[PDB]
Design a protein around this ligand. Structure first.
Ligand code: PRO
Ligand code: PRO
Ligand SMILES: [Cl-]
Ligand SMILES: [Hg+2]
Ligand SMILES: [Zn+2]
Ligand SMILES: [Zn+2]
Ligand SMILES: [Zn+2]
Lengths: 36, 36, 36
């Protein structure tokens, strides 16, 4: 049961880290447009 | 203790899912701003 | 081990909340530009 909790936390971290990456990509595309 | 942690984990999973839905809507918003 | 699980969850909650603040700032920039 503690391993299952550890796995859920690790999967949530993975999801959020990808989320952060997609947000970084959006900000970069907006910067290219404003400076285009 | 166990139930209090599960409650917070479930709330965090729901928050991260809503976080993704917002990010997808902003992506469409940026695309429209560039396309105009 | 339990304390480490609690510490991980709290760090993930703080990270998602910082994520939300950054998304809100991006949304405000997109709203300002699309109606400006
Ligand atoms: O504040 C500035 O420097 C940038 C220049 C392009 C749009 N805004
Ligand atoms: O960020 C600021 O300080 C101002 C107040 C709203 C619009 N920009
Ligand atoms: Cl601009
Ligand atoms: Hg998140
Ligand atoms: Zn175990
Ligand atoms: Zn276009
Ligand atoms: Zn708008």
């Amino acid at each position: 049961e503690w391993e299952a909790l550890e796995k859920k936390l690790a999967a949530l971290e993975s999801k959020c880290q990808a989320x952060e990456k997609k947000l970084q990509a959006l900000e970069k595309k907006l910067e290219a447009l404003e400076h285009g």
